[PDB]
Paper text:
Enzymatic decarboxylation of biobased hydroxycinnamic acids gives access to phenolic styrenes for adhesive production. To date, several PADs have been biochemically analyzed and structurally characterized. PADs adopt the lipocalin fold, and the core of the protein is formed by two mutually perpendicular β-sheets. In solution, a homodimer is formed by two monomers that are related by an improper 2-fold axis. In this study, we used ancestral sequence reconstruction to generate thermostable decarboxylases.
The relatively recent ancestor N31 has a significantly higher thermostability (Tm = 78.1 °C) than proteins from more distant clades, such as N2 (Tm = 56.1 °C) or N4 (Tm = 55.2 °C). Notably, although N31 did not evolve from thermophilic bacteria, it has a much higher thermostability and can perform decarboxylation reactions at temperatures exceeding 60 °C. We also aimed to improve the thermostability of N31 further using the publicly available PoPMuSiC server. To gain a better understanding based on their activity and stability, we determined the structures of N31, N55, and N134 via X-ray crystallography. The models for the remaining ancestors were predicted using AlphaFold 2.41 N31, N55, and N134 were crystallized with one, two, and three homodimers in the asymmetric unit at a resolution of 3.1, 1.6, and 2.5 Å, respectively. The ancestral PAD N31 showed high activity in DES/water mixtures and maintained activity in the presence of 70% (v/v) DES/buffer and at 60 °C, while BsPAD can perform decarboxylation in 50% (v/v) DES/buffer and at 30 °C. This allows applications in homogeneous solutions, which is beneficial, among others, for continuous flow setups. The specific activity of N31 increased notably from 30 to 60 °C, while BsPAD immediately precipitated at 60 °C. Thus, N31 bears all of the features of a thermostable enzyme. In contrast, N31 shows a specific activity of 50 U/mg at 60 °C, a temperature where the half-life time exceeds days. N31 retained its stability for more than 3 days, while under the same conditions, BsPAD rapidly lost its activity, preventing reliable half-life time determination. In addition to the half-life time, the thermal stability of the enzyme also increased in DES. Both N31 and BsPAD exhibited an ∼6 °C increased unfolding temperature in 70% (v/v) DES/buffer as determined by circular dichroism spectroscopy. N31 is a phenolic acid decarboxylase with unparalleled thermostability, allowing it to work under conditions of higher temperature and thus much better substrate solubility, which is a critical factor for the space-time yield of a biocatalytic process.
Numbering used by the authors:
A (entry chain A): 8 to 163
B (entry chain B): 5 to 165
The structure:
């Protein structure tokens, strides 16, 4: 049953300082905003995902990006803790700057960068995160993540 | 390493995915797996000394994450006492399209895997997200090079539990 995780919206800061934000918009879709980090400023609406419940309070959000980045987030909701593996093509660990946009406006651009690569070797980032903020926005709220990070109010 | 991983390191287990594929993993140490694919698209494939990221996410919830010389990336969440596993696998297009090219003792064909990797095509990624039942599960201790030391076909009589 995914009802537990669908609509969950949270900000979470990885052990390496990166402040990420997810809204699980439905059983197969997240929005996300990166506030801090390698790719701070980057955000994404309607990222197609695999979401599954691995046990009671252990959800997994799995996806591949137009950049070629693959991601598997284990989200432990009640425990307010998260683990992300990020499989960055070499060209995003090297030159992440073009990926820092509203991606939905630059999908063919991202795939063009993706295709020339270099894809290999992959740069894997495995980090725990503390979930600092967490709320239920319900399904299909396009207003949860509808701006870049810096365009949020100073208390968010 | 603090005690968090001691409940997963040394764990050797065979498991069958929702889609029928029998996989086998031995967590050989805090940063290394061996694995043996009995069945599936990549049945017969096996791997020694795969660099891996293991972490404990909760009690009985381990996460094991790696990228291969093929460009395949994997994150398996392992729930050991519940005898259940989940794997996401990020297959370069050329592995979903020509998985045979990857069905070997990879250690003896690493450059071949990287040549296929480099040749591509890498994209689009074929994401495979499946639950699996862990059907056999034992502790083989750390750094045992014997537990996965042959292909599935050269295993002994009744090695499937």
């Amino acid at each position: 049953d995914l009802s537990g995780f669908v609509g969950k919206h949270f900000i979470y800061t990885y052990d390496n300082g990166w402040r990420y934000e997810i809204y699980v918009k439905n059983e197969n879709t997240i929005d996300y905003r990166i506030h801090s980090g390698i790719v701070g400023g980057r955000w994404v609406k309607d990222q197609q995902v695999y979401i599954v419940r691995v046990a009671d309070d252990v959800y997994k959000i799995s996806w591949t990006e137009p950049t070629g980045t693959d991601v598997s987030l284990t989200v432990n909701l009640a425990d307010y803790i998260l683990h992300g593996t990020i499989f960055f093509p070499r060209w995003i660990i090297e030159n992440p700057e073009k990926t820092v946009c509203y991606q939905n406006d630059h999908l063919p651009l991202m795939r063009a960068y993706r295709d020339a690569g270099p894809t290999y070797p992959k740069e894997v980032i495995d980090e725990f995160a503390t979930i600092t903020f967490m709320r239920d926005c319900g399904e299909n709220n396009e207003t949860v993540i509808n701006c870049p990070p810096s365009e949020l109010p100073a208390d968010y």
